[model samples]
Target chain A: MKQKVVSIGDINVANDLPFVLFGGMNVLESRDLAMRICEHYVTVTQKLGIPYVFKASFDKANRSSIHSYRGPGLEEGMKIFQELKQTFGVKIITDVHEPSQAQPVADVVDVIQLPAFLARQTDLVEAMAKTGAVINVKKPQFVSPGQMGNIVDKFKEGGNEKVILCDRGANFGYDNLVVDMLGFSIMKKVSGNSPVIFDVTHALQRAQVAELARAGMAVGLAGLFIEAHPDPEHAKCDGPSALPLAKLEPFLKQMKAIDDLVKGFEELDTSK
Target chain B: MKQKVVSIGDINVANDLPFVLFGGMNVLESRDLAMRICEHYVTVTQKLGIPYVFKASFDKANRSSIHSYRGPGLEEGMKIFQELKQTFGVKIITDVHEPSQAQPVADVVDVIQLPAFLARQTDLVEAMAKTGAVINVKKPQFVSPGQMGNIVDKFKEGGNEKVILCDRGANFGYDNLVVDMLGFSIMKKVSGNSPVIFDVTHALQRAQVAELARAGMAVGLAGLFIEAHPDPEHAKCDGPSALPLAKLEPFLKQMKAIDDLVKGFEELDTSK
Candidate 1:
């Protein structure tokens, strides 16, 4: 029987069905701390039957404030990643801000995720594609579905076939943010033959950046780009968008039911 | 009888022959500080017999580090720009990170400069372009020139025609960076009718970032991004990449000589 889930390089994203990916970890902890976290993630995916791709950031480029956290620089952070991969055999995902960082990070991680801020950086996207790493590009919180093709093409131009398109959110008004469900469908249709991942945690962090700017600063979730903590409110870095750990079992059950409905729709035809 | 200057709304970018813009400042000052500096810019440009369009950022959405400074938040920062426009009576250019920011800032500024980070943001570009502000887009450092055409099209898709392209630099090897001079010319040719600006300052900053990364520490620019001051050694921010005000006059002189040669060649239809 043909395997339903596919192999993205050495990582399997889906055998026959799409699964969830957990992202937004800072990974500034010590090597021991990093290993502990990776073990926890591996165990969780195994229990839930979710194809896991561990995601963390080495640098937080493009901060609104100049004095934001940039992680443990490159060398230290990648060392930790190496330890985690050696300890656990799961695939990894990480944010690469500049084209210069892609090759080095690709050497460590399985999927090189494009920061939404650099989603349109053609040279970097092309370089990442050439590394032959599976790419999961988060749609910027500023764009809609209709115009995502050009971004996807950056990889095609580089002659790489492994890619994934992700939607984070869009601008609603002022400091407030919104998510369009249709963007996922649109991006999927335009991504050639690549699969799309709905980032539940990151998508949910789209909060209003202002209060008095003629709009509510409500940060609504499109589908979900969640930072799951069996107990989110107590998680280290991003707590606001983290779903309570208790909520995962039921949520995944419901998501599976929804997937069954979506599966019936003939897969988007891209044979041409 | 034809005008050599191109009008961005009521403001003109006068190239000795075909109107060019001096682009991208990473001054790293507060709203009040930025305006004061911009005030000085207006005087300097006028004294040099150049028409100036002030380009400033209310936020640095994509900093190399999370801890790096993002500009003052939107409202108060923009208020400073308003006062500058009202007091100086000069045309202003500023960037928008989100679609929602487009309309409110449009009411005050003459031109909307799109951040390269958000270049592929479909609806934001569409919404911002529809506002009819002469939009100047900074090509993401990782992008090539031909890809810039797709970015401009996103605006036209929103029913806009007044768009311009600006080139910063490209990611070279690792943290290294380089400028493809032909990018400015190619973008201009590909965009068909839109104008292009050579963003010299911030492109230089990318080179500095690579240096800091390699050294595993932040190395401040002593004379690099420094504004011209009798004593630039004491400037508070962006001193490294800030072009010393004293250096600007000489630099502009050299630039003018070269620009004349390049402009002459660009005007001719040499492609048979």
Candidate 2:
């Protein structure tokens, strides 16, 4: 069961819309590098006719190492977002680390993201809800997909209904992650038919990303979240989980074909 | 990889020992109910020559409904456990809800249990560790099996190494649970080869209980945790997950046979 369309600029995301792409780098490492990545995404997504949202973090507040690069600070990051929007004319989505960042970040981006670890923090949820921007809630690694219902209710209770569910994978053993494909429908069911999205950047392999995206789209999601790098071997963070920029076209092509085939199928009554 | 035997009274529990039955009721619903259930377990386990431990909870502090029965309080519950040990000549095991109950409960029962939700509470771990009694740590629904290593280390760091890991299934989607059969081996490898057990009463079927036990035993374990009721249809709690009292013999027979067959096999070094 699908819900109403969520519009970001001229783009429409619904379970029935051509699946949207929320794609970019993991962080805004530098202005020139950010431009190079966003330029590629815009060109490819335009050619493929996919509604697109550019995603990158101004600051990664939860890095394991204190020395890890956290990207340009909020002011400079928003300047880059403005430049990207002016140059490529794309709607942007980026994560806010704390309650205070929500309004400022929401003012720049079409959607403000709820980080996986802080999904349950009540004050952060209320602050983001107050922004009245489209909310992208990443299901926490520690919680089950069914628990997303409560998160959705929290946002709704805070007076926002433009909530989108994103699945990033769950804790599977130690130092590992696994996507339970069954979670997409459960999220859709429990979140009262909100548009569900799947992200595979935390998944270890491209094959896993492809396989899981096919399963996720077959269950019917409104969008996909992904990260890419020109040189994954030298990426500052999460290199192992990033896609090489050269492979983005083929990867999205395969996902697009699968989404089209599945969405075109006549509805089947299998529950009874 | 197997470890040395953990002696509980006259019973030897190890990966190599005949699979012990950690069997009884969900809670000490009543002294009469406790006797009825333990009597059935004693007769059936003795007939099968299975080393047995009687299990019941003094308090189910985390029930979904506030009105749900939580069994007799600590003082009266230990009284019933003492009665059970004296009357039936069986080793007893029951869970402690908080740190204060660990030593007193350990003084009564052969083993004191760490409830799933409280597994990470450092104070509870230290309190139970100081008891010098065997400890059973129920794997939290939210964590991975490899993460059980940290829990085991917590006990060992607190000056106790007599740790047992019990898997009661993981959160699969929502209210549902699923056994990752592969986790048995991971637990065996990661927890310095501590004994691991599986409980299927939370799994909802007797047939699944046999299947999972066979799988767990094949991987190697110290024992099994199970629950039964005189009349499962009218049981006080977790009725649907309970084994019918009449079916205990057949169920244990199947599990015992499978345990014997698997443990008898020569070690195969597939990795080498």
Candidate 3:
């Protein structure tokens, strides 16, 4: 009963039409390294013909140990994102935690993201929504997809409806996460057909079991990010989640086959 | 009208009585240091007149990374518990993952705990239950605690009744966990009066939010399992989840007050 198309920036991502985020190998790196990785990503996604957003965290707030890596300080990370946007002419996206972080982050990034934990931070969501930037809010893993409607409302309340809801993965047992594909069906209904992105790599990261989640990049999500690295493992930050960069071509070929199947389905108009 | 008293390895845990479990520290110290820690726990609990179980995971099977220390491995970790059990006659509790691990782990520890992730492993539960060892099954963060009745049935199907249920926390958002007291009420109805444990420290480990969970610990819980360290900021493995040793007395004092309130309300004769 709903239309299946939505927009992010100037691009439209149809419902059930998969678009990948070129992710990983940033956050912890220097500004130069961050820009270099983003460059490689733009090249890869352009060739794949997939809509792409660069996904990296500016701060890793949730490390188990106190001494673990946080991120390159926000100033440097955002500066690098600005450089990447200028160099590649590509839309950039990154997440923020506090309300004060919104305007500063929005100044450089194309899409401003909200961590699932802070999804209910009404003030933060409103502040981010006010930026007139495309807002992508991930459903809190602890909350059901339908509850995202309230999150959508916060954005709507901010008088910004350019919102995309993402399903990363839900919490399962302790130290594990699970992605319920049906969540896509559920969130789509609640968002009234707003664009929904399935973070295949974040989901796969959970499937990898108890590894540092940042390592989620190497677990085949780079393909979602569409990065043109020969060996992702060589990336200093997310070697575990990044497939070796050289493996990207064959991986993209496989992704293309799946994309074809999805496109074929969308060609049908079975309204009945 | 379910029975209210159950015994595990000669230690009776009452439906109405709150028990204590020491959340042992994970530091880069020698075995002697660990033994001393265990001794200090024994002395503290003995003076307090609290029936206690020495709880430590030999292998944190779901560490966020392969690079993280998984305890002193299973052999040395279990050996430490075994020594404590023999020297102090204390009851020991630890978790097991695979069915293959149940027997090996049960051979030394008094209780075999099923990790929340493996809650649905019927064969694993049945295998562990059939060992006639006490089994404590944790509710998976994804499933309703009432749904855990089915898991209890799996053990009953194995013709076992020595099952204790634990609630750490449930998913509230991605990487965020919440402890709902309602889980205890619901689980009690399904359990037919089986002992319900609220793992305060583990619940506090809800990762995504910086200190919301840690703050929740001070609010108190039933059957608190607090990890206390002389200086928590430096403790390895889970410094964020640990309460400063200085905070334990106040934390325990708060827990006792909550425990008394819960018990009084829980015990009003329903005949009225």
Candidate 4:
């Protein structure tokens, strides 16, 4: 079996453990906004007694529109992460777009994420795996959950064995996505014992059936990655899909309840 | 563009046409069973004013267990099809497993199907295409909907342009499947407007969220493939998810309502 628990800083990530929230903004719109978002996440997760990891992208290298906002550049973004880590005493998680960004970004964050589009790129997988940090591999919209093993294998072959699988949803059709929660069990089974987290923000953005899909994941999943904006309507990017900052507390309370109820049930062996 | 409306005998299968029913049993358990099922399908579809096609497999070549029931071989199957055609005067659709079986099966059935498992087998595709029969390609559980164009290209290149795409759900986890409804639009868009059909029985077999998935497909699709048994629990195969014969009329009534409501709406151009 794969390592049942991967330690990211002091947080223990396991399929059976209480979920770790990989919560933050989609992109670092600004250093002040990054700080503000992380501050809120820390407070909320702390009050809820949830293990938390802050998430944001230094560069959204793949914005649909060329004029769309990318995040703060790598150097400045790393500086912001360092400040957040120092200020809030929390672990951070951010995605890497290129192979060269792996080690430098890994230096500042607790876990380095492989972007969904770049998840299958061998060079990037190698670079990220060599960093010796926990790796969160996002399930690409194009790949099947069964095929995710090849990805986890690539990371293992490159040297890092501490890997986590994150599902952002899969491509349903042109410009659309669907979260197949049944995929979580397949990912866990195929990846040996690796934790599987739901990337809820991206999922909610593209999924037409968001509530039903969200509850399906909450039925049995390791964790979640959700983005929040204080003024979602006026936020710089992915604003339409962002959870209103006011809704964070109640939303997380519901998630915690699901995690507790689902995890407490006796697991079934349905293979026959 | 590929043929907008592929004609199989008197059936006109187009994206905008009234939906056709390709209904039958999982496998031809016996000649009597086949005749009984087809009789029921013909009567019901005639009563409901739905264009119809009979579906059954002479050889279920990929049964999960070695000892599982496979039907009467090709030669015997052809006799059954001929009798059914003579009796009901309805079109027939059945899957082809081996390359050699294509031509002979095409002689009896109006539409020759490419099983989801062998959808990419070039030799099978070539043989089936060469029969000059309409093709129904099941979207493989392992493939993305966008990639289905490659399979269509294989058939086109083999000199057959009369193709239909069928969704039988995709792999969500081990031994489980989920139908992504948005895929219907993508298949239509990418396959040069080929008609898309939902294989509802196989989908419902492994999907607990079957009804919701079915409603989504009904929104804008060309046709459907459903199986019903007089006694689903006592059937030879896939009984758990089969529609009980008693429920067939009501189930199809709901399907007809959905198809009408969905097709009556104006088509949107959401690309912007």
Q: What's the residue-level lDDT of B154 in candidate 2?
A: 63
Interface RMSD of 2: 7.9
TM-score of every model versus the real structure: 0.48, 0.56, 0.51, 0.55
lDDT of 1: 0.55
* lDDT for each residue of candidate 2 in A203-244, tens digit (9 for 90 to 100): 553556667667777776788888888987755454337778
- TM accuracy, model 4: 0.55
lDDT digits (tens) for residues B1-272 of candidate 1: 12123366655543224334343245336655666566566666667655466666677654233334556667766776787777776776788876678989888888787877666655466668668877778776555678777676656666777776666666653333466655555655567645656555566642243332222111110011113332345653441255555455555444444444444553445677
**A103-178 per-residue lDDT for model 4 (tens digits):** 9987889988887878889978888888989999988888888998889998899899999999877765577677
Model 1, A70-189: lDDT tens digits are 577877778767867767777667777656678888788887778776765554666677787777778766555655666766566676666666765565432334555555555555
| Model 3 CAPRI rating | incorrect
Which structure among the candidates has the greatest lDDT? 2
- Model 1 misplaced regions, further than 4 Å: A1-272, B1-6, B13-18, B23-28, B64-69, B206-240, B260-272
Which docking category, incorrect, acceptable, medium or high, applies to candidate 1?
A: incorrect
The alpha-carbon RMSD values of the candidates against the true structure, listed in the order shown, are 19.5, 9.0, 17.7, 11.3
List, residue by residue over A94-203, the lDDT tens digit for candidate 3. Answer: 88865667889877877777776556655466567667777777665567787777678757766677777776678776445677656766777778777766554455
Error of 4 at B141 (Å): 0.8
Question: Every prediction's TM-score for the first chain?
Answer: 0.77, 0.94, 0.80, 0.92
Candidate 4: segments with Cα more than 4 A from true spot: A1-236, A239-272, B1-3, B206-210, B236-240
lDDT, model 1, position B49? 51
B137-213 per-residue lDDT for model 2 (tens digits) = 88866677887887787677767888788888776654567878788888888888877788878654255656665
Candidate number that wins on lDDT, 1 or 2: 2
Instruction: Answer with 2 or 3, whichever has the higher TM-score.
Output: 2
For every candidate, the chain B TM-score is: 0.77, 0.93, 0.83, 0.92
